[PDB]
Structure 1
Amino acid sequence: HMQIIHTIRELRTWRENTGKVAFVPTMGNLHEGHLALVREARKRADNVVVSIFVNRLQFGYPRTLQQDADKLAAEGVAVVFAPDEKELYPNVEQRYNVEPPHLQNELCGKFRPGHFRGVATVVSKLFNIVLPDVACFGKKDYQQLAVIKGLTEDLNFDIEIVPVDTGRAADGLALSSRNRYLSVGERAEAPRLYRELQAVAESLKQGGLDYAGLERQAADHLTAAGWLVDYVEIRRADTLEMARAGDKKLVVLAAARLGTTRLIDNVEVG
């Protein structure tokens, strides 16, 4: 049933003659958050391609290839595309890169320079390899989602980009591999991130207009509780353009560290 394909030539050979394709790009180490992407994908096309590739160009990491394909076989995945580095980067350098706008240096990008350029570039390469009709990305990595929506529009990729809802724990914590780094005490404290975002969201829903004050209060509550806050920001939904007074479709985003571990989350408000 399911095929494991490692070369661009074999992937293209398989994809021709096939109809609609839904595509889920990942870096492996698959968990429940990823399966949400896969399940939504399978609701949109009979042929689901999942890519597993770790990208030297977006790092600042485990493999477990055998376990990954087993989790996906159960979910009706047609093809797992897992090329090696040289397959995608046959020369050392990547000479032609997809260059994001200034968004790449904001929010998470301020402490991950080059990261979103690397994401945009490898996703463009993957789009040109798989030629998908639909591609699923999770709302938890909102800035990544905006960059991928932006490159899709600006480069005329004929691909429907499908945001997939953030899976959360029972206590509200957004599911992420990063959670495994948290000590027992930190994991009990970790749900405060989502709680503060929701409180910002309620203030906005209740006519609150002081964006900067709301961000600071959320940051102050996190800091006082032991977090090291990277940012809390209110921006326009989908595009992450600056939030303007009177905007009705907004998103609150935050990134903050408990010890050595950085957590991110966000809440959309309408």
Structure 2
Amino acid sequence: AMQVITSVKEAKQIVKDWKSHQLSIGYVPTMGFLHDGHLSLVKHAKTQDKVIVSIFVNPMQFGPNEDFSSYPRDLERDIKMCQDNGVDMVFIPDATQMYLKNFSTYVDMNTITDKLCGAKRPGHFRGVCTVLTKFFNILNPDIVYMGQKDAQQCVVVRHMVDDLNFDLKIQICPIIREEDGLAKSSRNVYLSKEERKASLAISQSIFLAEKLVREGEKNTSKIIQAMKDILEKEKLIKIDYIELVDFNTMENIENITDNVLGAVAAFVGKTRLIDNFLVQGLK
């Protein structure tokens, strides 16, 4: 029967026992209120012998001005979806298990995190790096499955893993979308009917930019303007950024050569949404 584990000590024991049987471990870190995007990561993780999903709304990666208190939470919904989709262990620690009274250590970095959302969200990537170092040490996974939707986060965590010699692989999985094109996110639940309609311009701008790139358009300023024109038609949308950047460095690019990450962040009403497309190996 699937284990629902709230203790670090017990999670360690279970993983240690699985390792005693030379079983591989697939790990899907999440902040709960699960959706088909998460289920897609789980499906990939089932290539491994055992699958772990963590659920933890990590307070370190939210700032004071953001949505920690309202973040959607429904642990019964999540347990059921993990149960129905063949998850072996749902690890749901609370902040008192993860961060003891005198906790004071962190993991951070001096490149990558200063761009895109990192520039808009001070402290965010330190929160991500620190909590994932902890989870990786607790759970000892072999492959960690992450969504391309958080593209910068994937690159940041990959770089941390490289730099700190974590003996595991980060596997980036494609963006899963709603029927109407909106990238799956737990924050979608915040949107009003009218905001939901407005929010489709984000994915529209992504589909168009990707088509332009694959049709051989190299000038990023041309592409950005085209996305901007789509997004500016929606009064409910306030653009945070639209940037085409190198996928490995997050540095803005003026002319596309081998690759591009085209990334958008925008507020739809008060809700902050992100989306992107990624093209690699261009001639």
Alignment correspondent of 2:255 = 245
Is residue 3–residue 79 contact of structure 1 (8 Å, CA) maintained in 2? yes
Superposition pairs of residues 1-270 of structure 1, within 5 angstroms: 1-18=1-18, 19-42=23-46, 44-60=47-63, 61-92=71-102, 94-226=103-235, 227-243=237-253, 245-270=255-280
Once the two structures are superposed, residues 23-65 of structure 1 have per-residue CA deviations (whole angstroms, 9 ceiling, x without a partner) of 11111112222111111111x2121111111211111234322
The two structures, once aligned, show a CA RMSD in angstroms of 1.7
Q: Matched residues in 2 for 1:34 and 1:261: separation?
A: 20
Is residue 51–residue 81 contact of structure 1 (8 Å, CA) maintained in 2? yes
Evaluate the alpha carbon distance shift between residue 220 and residue 234 of structure 1 in structure 2; reply closer, same or farther with a 3 A threshold: same
Q: Matched residues in 2 for 1:63 and 1:197: separation?
A: 29
Q: Matched residues in 2 for 1:205 and 1:90: separation?
A: 50
Quick one: which amino acid aligns to residue 103 of structure 1? I
CA shift for structure 1 position 185: 2.0
Quick one: which amino acid aligns to residue 28 of structure 1? G
Is residue 137–residue 145 contact of structure 1 (8 Å, CA) maintained in 2? yes
Once the two structures are superposed, residues 106-154 of structure 1 have per-residue CA deviations (whole angstroms, 9 ceiling, x without a partner) of 2112221101110011001100000111110111111111111111111
Quick one: which amino acid aligns to residue 32 of structure 1? D
Identity %: 39
**What are structure 2's unaligned runs of at least 5 residues?**
64-70
Q: Matched residues in 2 for 1:224 and 1:4: separation?
A: 46
Is residue 255–residue 264 contact of structure 1 (8 Å, CA) maintained in 2? yes
My pick for the range that moved more, 59-68 or 147-156, is 59-68
Alignment correspondent of 2:68 = none
My pick for the range that moved more, 186-195 or 123-132, is 186-195
Quick one: which amino acid aligns to residue 213 of structure 1? K
Quick one: which amino acid aligns to residue 178 of structure 1? R
Once the two structures are superposed, residues 140-195 of structure 1 have per-residue CA deviations (whole angstroms, 9 ceiling, x without a partner) of 11111111111111111111111122111222111112222222122222221111
SS of equivalent residue, structure 1 residue 24: strand
SS of equivalent residue, structure 2 residue 177: coil
Quick one: which amino acid aligns to residue 10 of structure 1? E
Q: Matched residues in 1 for 2:154 and 2:197: separation?
A: 28
SS of equivalent residue, structure 2 residue 59: coil
Quick one: which amino acid aligns to residue 133 of structure 1? D
Q: Matched residues in 2 for 1:86 and 1:16: separation?
A: 23
Is residue 236–residue 247 contact of structure 1 (8 Å, CA) maintained in 2? no
My pick for the range that moved more, 112-121 or 211-220, is 211-220
Is residue 216–residue 232 contact of structure 1 (8 Å, CA) maintained in 2? no
Q: Matched residues in 2 for 1:219 and 1:212: separation?
A: 10
SS of equivalent residue, structure 1 residue 151: helix
Is residue 219–residue 231 contact of structure 1 (8 Å, CA) maintained in 2? no
Quick one: which amino acid aligns to residue 229 of structure 1? I
